């Protein structure tokens, strides 16, 4: 069989947990025939399975996670795995509203004396 990731995105949460519990059993029946000697066709199938279990542990942790980032959307306190990971000094720079703040004294020293524009002749 051929199993893709463009037919798993909206199915049941525990159906994929069942098909996973069937592929681990099937992989266990090939670790047995490796030691005791088996077909070369029943040996190279094990890369198919080991790389077709991961497409399920992936689609699971996705559809599991975009609900946590939907339930914690508008809230002010959100967990550490969710608040955005950039660098150390970039979590600690001053925010955009606090950079774009001026004083009252400057804001009344820009009502009367802005910067003009001009040009002289030769």
């Amino acid at each position: 069989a051929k199993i893709k990731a463009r037919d798993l995105r909206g199915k049941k949460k525990e159906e994929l947990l069942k098909q996973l519990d069937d592929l681990k059993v099937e992989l266990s029946q090939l670790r047995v025939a490796k030691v005791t000697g088996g077909a070369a066709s029943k040996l190279s199938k094990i890369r198919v399975v080991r790389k077709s279990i991961a497409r399920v542990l992936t689609v699971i942790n996705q559809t599991q996670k975009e609900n946590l980032r939907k339930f914690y959307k508008g809230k002010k306190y959100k967990p550490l795995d969710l608040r955005p990971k950039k660098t150390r000094a970039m979590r600690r720079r001053l925010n955009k509203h606090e950079e774009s703040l001026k004083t009252k004294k400057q804001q009344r020293k820009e009502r009367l004396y802005p910067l003009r524009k001009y040009a002289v002749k030769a």
């Binding site: 955005p84 990971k85 950039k86 660098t87 970039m90």
Partner: protein, 86 residues
Amino acid sequence: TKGTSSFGKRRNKTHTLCRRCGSKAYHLQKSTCGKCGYPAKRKRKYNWSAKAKRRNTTGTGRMRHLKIVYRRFRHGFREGTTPKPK
């Protein structure tokens, strides 16, 4: 009797494997490494041997976070967005 016939009395050990540097320099009685200073906090390094640094620096191992920071930098550390879904 200070030579050959006194090389037979060597059976116990002083140094053993560290667990921070990985080398075999963990003194047992003094409990401190000679290579890296384990119970100390700061890693022992000196400047008089510029050859003993390049045995133990950054460009040596894996850089399992720095090589994916040297990649994320050139897009301004984007998060969140995706390529266009088709």
